Write a protein that binds this ligand. Structure first.
Ligand SMILES: N#Cc1ccc(-c2nc3ccccc3c(=O)[nH]2)cc1
Ligand SMILES: [Zn+2]
Length: 208
């Protein structure tokens, strides 16, 4: 049921998604080990992910959460990187897309920093890097990330350096407590709480 609609680079929607991609790059504590060395991306394509059944699955859950939280879904747009991006856009998020070993338990993880999600494009820790060159810092190969609509509801705040949500909460927020430049990361424990709105195709760019 999924169709992908290309956005034009002239479209304000392309431009605002690109700006969120580019402006949320940061340096990582691994010096680029997992995701590569870069300060910015070459955006090759942005597509809207259109699936009526998956969208209705998301909105149904969003209303349930909203009604449990004084009519506030606490909806965000966040990045997701995964080797399973193709399955996700076709079948939706579910338990098979969870980070079993994540620091907030087995759930589906999202990031404010696009460069954080970029570390997972080729697997946990960047895996063995790109299929073609086995390079986690490949500047040639095309990568994909999702920019997703995510319902957080009442989020459990974890200060720090599938399972169930903590009782009385709908998500977990991983607040950065050491690296002053890191943005928040978030975990949901029901795949119905995220919709993969945009598929972004890009390369990381070698710094000059
Ligand atoms: N298998 C698998 C698997 C796929 C994706 C991730 C993943 N983790 C993150 C952890 C923190 C912040 C963001 C992410 C993310 O975008 N993605 C983790 C594991
Ligand atoms: Zn490559």
């Amino acid at each position: 049921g999924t169709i992908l609609i290309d956005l034009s680079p002239d479209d304000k929607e392309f431009q605002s998604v690109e700006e969120e991609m580019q402006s949320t790059v940061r340096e990582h504590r691994d010096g680029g080990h997992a995701g590569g060395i870069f300060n910015r991306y070459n955006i090759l394509k942005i597509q809207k992910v259109c699936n009526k059944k998956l969208w209705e699955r998301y909105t149904h859950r969003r209303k349930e959460v909203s009604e449990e939280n004084h009519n506030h879904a606490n909806e965000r747009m966040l990045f997701h990187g995964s080797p399973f991006v193709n399955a996700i856009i076709h079948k939706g998020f579910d338990e098979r897309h969870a980070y079993i070993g994540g620091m907030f338990g087995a759930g589906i993880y999202f990031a404010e920093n696009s460069s954080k999600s970029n570390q997972y494009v080729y697997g946990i820790g960047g895996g063995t890097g790109c299929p073609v060159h086995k390079d986690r810092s490949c500047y040639i190969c095309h990568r994909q990330l999702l920019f997703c609509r995510v319902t957080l509801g009442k989020s459990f705040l974890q200060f720090s350096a599938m399972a169930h949500s903590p009782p009385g909460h709908h998500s977990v927020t991983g607040r950065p407590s050491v690296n002053g430049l890191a943005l928040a990361e978030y975990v949901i424990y029901r795949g119905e709480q995220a919709y993969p709105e945009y598929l972004i195709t890009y390369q990381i760019m070698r710094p000059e």
